Every structure is written in C-alpha cells, then in structure tokens.
C-alpha cells in the first residue's frame, strides 16, 4: 500500500500557493529557487546546442542554466564543483540535466486528489518570490483557496512523458469535464462581481478607458469599435468592450423568468457572433454552467481558444473594476428603520402562534397526525412556525437592500453569498438544532439553569431571535455554540467516511476500461457493459438538448 503503489519520489516540489490574475489559465508561476533546483535531462542535438551550451556555461545558480552533464561513459560531470566547469565542449549524444524553464510541461496537483482534475499539466512561467502562483479560474478542480493551501508539483523526465502531460493531462483539455458533462472551470470573485457590473445598461465607459481596455486584451484586432453612443459625448457600453474578448462564430441564447427580446430586467442572454446584444452577464452565463459561454466556446472554437478566453475576460474586467472599485460595510447589513419594526413583529406573531399551539396542546385538544406522537406533532408544528418566521423576516429584509447594497451586489452576480446569509445577518438568525431536533434537555427538564423546568417555548429550546448584527444573548450564544459544534464534528467525520468511499469505489472499478471493441470490461475479459454508457460515447462530448418530438399538443405537433 505504502511503498509499491504509492512511493515517495524524486524531481518533485511543494510550496504555498497564491492567486495571480495576469497569468494565463493553463500556467503555473513556479518560483525561481525551485526552478534553480529541479531538472529535466535534455539530449544534445544540432537543433539545441547553441542555447544548450550557454546553459552549461551559465552554471547552476543564474536561472536559465543547469547542473550536471552526462557523457557516453555515463560519467557524471558536476557543474557546481569540477575544475572543468567553465569549459566542456558539448558532444552530440550526451545529456544535460537543466533548470526547468519557461514553457515546460509539469504536473501540478493539490491533495486530496479526488479527480483527474486534481492533477493537471501546466505551462511553467518562472518568477520571483516563493509561491506557486496560479490563475483564479483553475480554482474549482483543485479545490484550492489562498489561506495557506499547499501544492505539489511533479516534473516529467522522458520526451514521451512530456508528451503524455501536454496531450492528455493539460489544463485546457480538462476544462470541459466528463464528470458532470459540463465545464468545471468558471469565473470567480472579483472578476465575476465585475463581469457583471461592467455589464449593466447603466455602465458607460468613455474613450480613454476604452483604449487601455481594448489594448489590455492580447488578441485585440486593433480596431476601435464604433461607440454605441456618438451624440453629445461618444460613449461605449460595458457589454460593448467585453464583446471584444468574445471570439467569433459564438452564439448564445438564454431566457430566464421575465425575458422578451426587450429584457426590461436586462434578463437572460443574447449573443450573436462574439457580440453581446442584451442581458447582464453573470454566473448563469459565464460561470461553470452547462449552457455556459465556456461550454460553447470550448466545443465550438477549441480548447486552446477557450483557455486564452479566460485570461482575456479576466484581464479586461479585472482592469475596469480596479478603476471602478468595490467594497462592503456594516452599512450593507443595516436595513430600514421601519423594516426592523416589521421584522420584529413578524417574529412576534410567530411567538404567539407557538404559544397558542403550546396552550392548545396543554389542554389535550391538539390532535395527532396519523402515525406520530402528539408531542412530535407539537414539535413539528412549532419548528415549522419559526422556520417560516425566520424566512419571512429574511425575505422582508431581502427587499430594503437596494440595488447598490454591496452584499446584494455580490449575491446578484452569484459571486458569494445567498438569501440565508442576508437573513441571518440583517434579520433573525433562527432556530438552532442538534441531531435534527431543537435544543435538548441536558439538565433535568430544562435547557439551562436560567429556565424553569418543563419549558417548551422558543427562547428556552434554542430559538435565536436576534441577528448576527444586533448580537446574540448569553443563552442564544450557548445554544448557537452547540449548533456548529455538531457542524464541525460531522464535517471532519464526513471527510473520513468519504475518503474511504473514494478508495473502495476506486478499488472495485479501477481496472475497467473500454477496449478496442467498444465493449467495457475488466482484467478477466468478463464483460460489464456491451457499449460504454450504453451509447459508446464519452461524457465530455455531450449536452442537454430538447427532444421536441416529446412535448405539446397532438395539434401543435401537427401544426
């Protein structure tokens, strides 16, 4: 298990990582000391020598040089000691362990490795500082975040092995994943909060910005596109310049709820030949979605086109935003004075709801729902009542937050947050729960020793009425505590229960592979599936289309 199927190995490295946006998707910022150490054995040849010798000359301490040289006899020439280390006429049919350089193929992984995607070939770009730098939008597959996450990097030694990395393993090949027949790489955080606000109808960009932005895009054709607005002052729309990043022959149609080829909500999405016609660009369009700009551009234009795409989208939006800016206060969790009044009483009405059902139940009038205890149908009624109270207080809040409220602004992008996150911050936090049920009686017949016994009211059984804003009470806090201990527990218990699943799942299937007869069988030749997936089709090459033979009138089938 430990020494045969999973060895420790030479030619490998590991560092802290951090995110860098001016770095193409399929690239990896390798810091310089590491590239000063790691080595690929190159074989001397007419084609290379000139460069190659300059390395040997340079020596193993100025970046683009090398260590050791190896000869016919296989003797090892140590370029760091050795008298003859400013010398050495390179003789065809030798080798020259050399410093990893710009544009080499390397396997860049993060543990735990629960995919193909947790291991991908990247394109080296040597840099100062000591961080494996990488592109934001290669986050999801690795499952990284930059709070100290550490990452391994492996280096191929064989000409064939290099091929195996660039042709099978490479990042742009992995974009459109077979796993969920969709793309696994999207546009996240700053980039995405921006891929949007740039986009609003309202957002207008005048000549001087435009010109840097245009330029900022590498592929840019060098043709200032005609501004939407020419009148008083010749302006360009957000949409407009972002359209530049989009290549050509690209077609996309969305439609959400209130959408109409006029889109008075600037809803949905319409894009005709690398040109954006209406609708805000946000996660649905440019996330790791299925209908996804990225699912399209990949299959349509190619892997390498969509790979550069990411960079360009980023570079422009990352720029624009940098000059527009964005933030978040506690003001973004405050909400209207009269609403806090409405929110409060909206809770209050649910506290009498439960009270009443408590008082009803206390008189044996509460009837039992077929197949559960009166006590379970008391509990159930109550829990619901205060869940429906939290929610409604929440929704009440989702409304004050105006279209400029920075929390809501990230929410509308689909960049970070959710309704719940607003609910709990601005409104009420809600009911606390342990093992599904509301807060137990650890003490005898009471929750804490600040309560009278036999008290099934909310307060007492772990309803947190306040928000994370106003602040919790001693009791609320302590229940709330119990809340996310249970949380923390099964989190680090989910991770083990699962780490075993992914081991057995793997260990049973493992040797299965489609053979050259499009069957699907194991080591013994015992057949499992007579055609892979029952249509002999790779999952990556597949998408949600509609079968309009299925639905609609016998009339309108015939119409």
């Amino acid at each position: 298990r430990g020494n045969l199927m999973g060895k420790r190995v030479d030619f490998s490295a590991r560092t802290v990582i951090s995110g860098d946006p001016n770095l193409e998707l399929d690239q990896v910022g390798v810091p310089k000391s590491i590239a000063k150490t790691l080595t690929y054995p190159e074989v001397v040849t007419p084609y290379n020598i000139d460069r190659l010798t300059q390395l040997v000359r340079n020596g193993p301490n100025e970046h683009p040089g090398a260590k050791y040289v190896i000869r016919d006899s296989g003797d090892r020439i140590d370029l760091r000691y050795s008298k003859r280390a400013g010398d050495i006429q390179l003789q065809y049919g030798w080798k020259v362990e050399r410093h990893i350089m710009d544009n080499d193929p390397v396997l860049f992984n993060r543990q735990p490795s629960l995919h193909k995607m947790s291991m991908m070939a990247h394109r080296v770009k040597v840099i100062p500082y000591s961080t494996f730098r990488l592109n934001l939008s290669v986050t999801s597959p690795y499952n990284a975040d930059f709070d100290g996450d550490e990452m391994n990097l492996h280096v191929p030694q064989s000409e064939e092995t290099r091929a195996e990395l660039s042709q099978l393993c490479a990042v742009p090949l992995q974009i459109v994943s077979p796993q969920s027949n969709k793309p696994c790489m999207g546009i996240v955080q700053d980039t995405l909060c921006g891929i949007r606000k740039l986009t609003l109808r309202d957002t207008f960009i005048e000549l001087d910005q435009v010109l840097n932005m245009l330029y900022w895009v590498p592929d840019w054709d060098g043709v200032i596109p005609t501004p939407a607005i020419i009148k008083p002052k010749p302006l360009w729309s957000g949409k407009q310049i972002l359209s530049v990043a989009i290549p050509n022959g690209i077609h996309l149609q969305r439609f959400d709820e209130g959408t109409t080829l006029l889109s008075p909500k600037d809803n949905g999405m319409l894009i005709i030949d690398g040109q954006i016609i209406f609708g805000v660009v946000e996660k649905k369009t440019v996330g790791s979605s299925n209908g996804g700009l990225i699912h399209v551009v990949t299959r349509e234009k190619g892997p390498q086109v969509c790979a550069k795409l990411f960079g360009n989208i980023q570079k422009v939006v990352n720029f624009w935003l940098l000059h527009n800016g964005f933030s978040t206060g506690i003001g973004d969790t405050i909400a209207d004075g009269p609403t806090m009044r409405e929110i409060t009483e909206t809770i209050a009405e649910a506290k009498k709801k439960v009270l009443d059902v408590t008082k009803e139940a206390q008189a044996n009038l509460l009837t039992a729902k077929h197949g559960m205890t009166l006590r379970e149908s008391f509990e159930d009624n109550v829990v619901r009542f205060l869940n429906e109270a939290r929610d409604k207080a929440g929704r009440l809040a989702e409304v004050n937050l105006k279209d400029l409220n920075n929390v809501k602004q990230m929410v509308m992008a689909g960049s970070k947050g959710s309704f719940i996150n607003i609910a709990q911050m601005s409104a009420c936090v809600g009911q606390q729960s342990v093992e599904g049920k509301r807060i137990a009686f650890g003490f005898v017949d009471r929750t804490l020793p600040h309560f009278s016994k036999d008290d099934y009211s909310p307060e007492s059984k772990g309803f947190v009425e306040n928000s994370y804003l106003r602040g919790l009470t001693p009791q609320e806090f302590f229940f709330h505590a119990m809340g996310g201990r249970e949380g923390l527990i099964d989190t680090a218990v989910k991770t083990a229960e699962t780490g075993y699943i992914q081991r057995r799942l793997v260990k049973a299937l493992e040797d299965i592979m489609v053979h050259y007869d499009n069957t699907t069988r194991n080591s013994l030749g015992n057949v499992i599936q007579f055609i892979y997936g029952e249509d002999g089709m790779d999952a990556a090459h597949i998408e949600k289309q509609s079968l309009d033979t299925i639905g609609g009138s016998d009339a309108a089938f015939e119409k």
């Binding site: 199927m5 077979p178 049973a508 299937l509 493992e510 040797d511 499992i528 599936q529 029952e534």
Partner: protein, 159 residues
C-alpha cells in the same frame, strides 16, 4: 404526490395523485393486495426489490437510489458513471458489496486484492491454492513498475 401525464388532447398536464408512504417493508405481500397498482409500487430497499423482481430490476433501483443520494444535494452526475458502478455490483448474478466481501473475493489475480483491505491472508491462500496471476490488472503492473494496459499502454507500437 405530483405527476406529469398526457392529456387526451396531447399536452402534458398535472394530474395530482394519491400515494401511500410506508415505514417498514414486506414487498412480498403488499403488491398482491387489491387496489394498489403492482406495476409501480416502489421500495427504497433495492435489496428487497432484487429478491422479488429479479436482478435486472434490482440494478435499476440500486441506481435510482444512488441517484437520489447525489441529486438531493443539487449535484448532477452524468448517468454512465453511476450506471457502470451499479452494473459492476450487479453482474456476478447477485448484489456484490463494494467492501472486501463482495469485490475482493471475486476470482481476480491475487496482487490486485492485495492492494486493498486484507493483504497478508490473501497472499497466503494465494500461496496454498497456487493461484496464477494474469498480470493484466492496473494495480499489478504498478507493483512491478511496468507499462499499464491503459490509454497509452493498451495498444502496442511497431514498424
């Protein structure tokens, strides 16, 4: 429950229906009752499905249940994957656990079953029975450090 079904006129529409949900299982006797539809009746015990309706129905619950596990979290996984899993479990004739009892007593060469839960024992009863390891399996060509019957190594190269 809510059901989507043909109207006479062609449109699919909401005919809402009346289903009974149980706490306990005896398929053997509930489908034989009057008034139920024995053509539909479902148990989450894919184990009870199998012993009753044969292996090929069993499969199609095992899946259905694996699906409802993944799907109830929002997540979509393309069929084939889960299909394969389900297909492998269900082809020896019976239901075959993804633990050392199902998939690790299953005829295979020895070195493969080695690389998993009961290592030594399996090497011993491989020793005494005088098993002949094929060397067609992934795990085995990794041990001996050779090119695996895999993407790159499935074919051969020549002239």
């Amino acid at each position: 429950y809510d059901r989507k079904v043909p109207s006479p006129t062609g449109e699919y529409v909401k005919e809402p229906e009346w289903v009974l949900e149980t706490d306990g299982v005896n398929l053997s006797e509930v489908m034989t009752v009057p008034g139920i539809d024995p053509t539909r009746i479902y148990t989450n015990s894919f184990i009870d499905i199998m012993e009753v309706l044969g292996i090929e129905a069993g499969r199609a619950a095992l899946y259905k249940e694996v699906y409802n596990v993944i799907a109830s979290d929002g997540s979509y996984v393309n069929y084939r994957h889960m299909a394969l899993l389900v297909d492998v479990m269900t082809t020896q004739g019976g239901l075959t656990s993804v633990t050392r009892h199902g998939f690790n007593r299953s005829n295979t060469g020895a070195l493969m079953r080695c690389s998993f839960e009961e290592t030594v024992e399996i090497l011993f009863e491989a020793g005494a029975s005088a098993e002949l390891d094929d060397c067609r399996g992934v795990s085995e060509n990794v041990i001996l450090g050779q090119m695996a019957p895999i993407g790159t190594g499935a074919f051969d190269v020549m002239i």
